[PDB]
């Protein structure tokens, strides 16, 4: 199985996927706000998606999405993630975070394939935690656009919706899971999701996740189960504010990390 | 005794071991078994470089060197001991809280050979021939069996 080689196109999927979606970005505000990175051996920022090699599947999906110039967050975060460096990014929803992490993560899954374990109940290769159904679904739809013609099947699960059908959807295959934290703990307790092969971990809107009381659930998913530890998994944490509790989560969860600040 | 089998690719074993050691309490006594194809020096010296107090045994060294390493270990001055199976023959491991199989052996009998509170074993494709035997054993000890380990025994 070559994971770097596009699967055949489907007109209906292209129609469902590449018409009628939004980037979740405010380019007016955020193109003109500078980004700063600090840390050891910080990879240099890019000016174009072409400046790193994200491979055939992403470059075609980029053309179908009609994405052009990256936002400043994307210019700094994409090379960092592409180097497999952990990241703490103080960056707002609307600055361009989602693609900043999804493009290089998916790119790396494509050129590395699933791994020997999967090449041999669901064990996602990538996990993204989000505080809310709305952001979880935003991210899931972006993942769907950039996994078009790939073996990666994204899924999303959230609370306040029925666990039964989410289970039934997982059972159809899941390589990248977007989840709100309490719903994932339920799925783990029911034996539906395994974290043994999760090599890419993203916490989005981490400050809101903590404020809504999810820190116990997050520590259980990340620290007290089978998720590979830092230095093995690659971890990215995004937050619009940087209070003491986020700095603690950063220090606990990230390894030798670059810090990115918008403004 | 808690037996935990984790999937760890070769290129991730060192970083996984660092995390297993960073969680050790006051660094209780930990024994790390490595394949002779890697050698105990490679792991001991990496741990030292990374700032860890540790030591090693080998089967070809002087009894003086062995006993100095074993005393550093036993007394808690170097609470991590790296060893191959051959080097650890005759070793009294009754004071070891944590055994880490950095490399698993070829056969389940050697695994059975190795105050013990926890045995963590690293597993990847190189260990496929021992999947069912390791499976059967974990059932006997009423131990957690990872789903992926059964699906690999298949």
Elucidation method: X-ray
* β-sheet with A87-90: strand ranges across: A35-38, A258-262, A87-90, A234-239, A200-203, A126-129, A176-179, A154-157
The resolution, in angstroms to one decimal, equals 2.3
**Domain-located, residue A128:** yes
**Domain-located, residue A4:** no
First to last CA, chain B: 26
Instruction: Tally the domains of chain A.
Output: 1
Interface test with A, best of B7, B17, B153 (most A CBs within 10 A): B7
Domain extent for B32: 1-154
* Residues paired with residue B122 on neighbouring β-strands, in sequence order: B6
**Domain-located, residue A103:** yes
**Domain-located, residue A249:** yes
Maximal C-alpha separation, chain A: 49
> In what helix (H) or strand (E) does residue A237 lie, and over which residues does it extend?
strand A234-239
Of A116, A194, A228, nearest to B16 by CB-CB distance is A228
CA nearest to A193 within chain B:
B147
Instruction: Tally the domains of chain B.
Output: 1
**Domain-located, residue A6:** no
Domain extent for A140: 11-262
The one-character DSSP state at A141 is H
**Domain-located, residue A1:** no
State the Cα–Cα distance between residues A230 and A249, nearest whole angstrom: 12
A96 known ligand binder: yes
CB contact under 8 A, B151 and A197: no
A190 known ligand binder: no
Closest CA to A240 of A138, A115, A26, A95: A95
**Domain-located, residue A221:** yes
SS3 annotation, chain B: CEEEEEECCHHHHHHHHHHHHHCCCCCCCEEEECCCCCCHHHHHHHHHHCCCCEEECCCCCCHHHHHHHHHHHHCCCCCEEEECCCCCCCCCCCCCCEEEECCCCCCHHHHHHCCCCEEEEEECHHHHHHHHHHHHHHHHCCCCCCHHHHHHHC
Chain breaks in chain B (C to N over 2.5 A) after: 114
State the Cα–Cα distance between residues A104 and A111, nearest whole angstrom: 11
CB contact under 8 A, A197 and B18: no
**Domain-located, residue A5:** no
Report helix, strand or coil for A235. strand
- How is residue A244 written in tokens? 């003491």
């Amino acid at each position: 199985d070559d994971w770097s080689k596009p699967l055949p196109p489907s007109e209906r999927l292209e129609q469902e996927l590449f018409s009628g979606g939004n980037t979740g970005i405010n380019f007016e505000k955020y193109d003109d706000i500078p980004v700063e990175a600090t840390g050891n051996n910080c990879p240099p920022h890019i000016e174009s998606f072409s400046d790193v090699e994200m491979g055939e599947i992403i470059m075609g999906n980029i053309e179908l999405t009609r994405y052009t110039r990256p936002t400043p967050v994307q210019k700094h975060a994409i090379p960092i993630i592409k180097e497999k460096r952990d990241l703490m990014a103080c960056a707002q929803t609307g600055s361009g975070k989602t693609a900043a992490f999804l493009l290089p993560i998916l790119s790396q899954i494509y050129s590395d394939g699933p791994g020997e374990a999967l090449r041999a109940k669901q064990y996602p290769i990538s996990l993204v935690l989000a505080p809310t159904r709305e952001l979880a679904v935003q991210i899931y739809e972006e993942a769907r656009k950039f996994s078009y013609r790939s073996r990666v099947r994204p899924c999303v699960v959230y609370g306040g919706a029925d666990i039964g059908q989410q289970i039934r959807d997982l059972e159809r295959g899941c390589h990248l899971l977007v989840a709100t934290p309490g719903r994932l703990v339920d799925m783990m307790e029911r034996g539906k999701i395994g974290l043994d092969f999760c090599k890419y971990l993203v916490l989005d809107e981490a400050d809101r996740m903590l404020d809504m009381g999810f820190e116990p659930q997050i520590r259980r998913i990340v620290e007290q189960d089978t998720m590979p530890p830092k230095g093995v998994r690659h971890t990215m944490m995004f937050s619009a504010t940087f209070p003491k509790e986020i700095q603690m989560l950063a220090r606990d969860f990230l390894d030798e990390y670059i810090f990115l600040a918008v403004g | 005794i808690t037996q935990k089998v984790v999937w760890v690719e070769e290129s991730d074993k060192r970083s996984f071991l660092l995390d297993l050691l960073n969680a050790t309490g006051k660094d209780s006594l930990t024994l790390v078994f490595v394949d002779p194809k890697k050698g105990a020096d490679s792991l001991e010296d990496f741990l030292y470089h990374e700032g860890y107090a540790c030591t090693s045994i080998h089967g070809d060294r002087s009894q003086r060197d062995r006993e100095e390493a074993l005393h550093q270990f036993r007394s808690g001055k170097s609470p991590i001991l790296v060893a191959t199976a051959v080097a650890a023959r005759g070793l009294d491991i009754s004071n070891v809280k944590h055994v880490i199989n950095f490399d698993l052996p070829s056969d389940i009998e050697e695994y059975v050979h190795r105050n013990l509170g926890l045995a963590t074993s690293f597993f990847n494709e190189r260990n496929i021939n021992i999947t069912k035997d390791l499976l059967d054993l974990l059932v006997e000890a009423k131990q957690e069996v990872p789903s992926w380990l059964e699906n690999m025994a298949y």
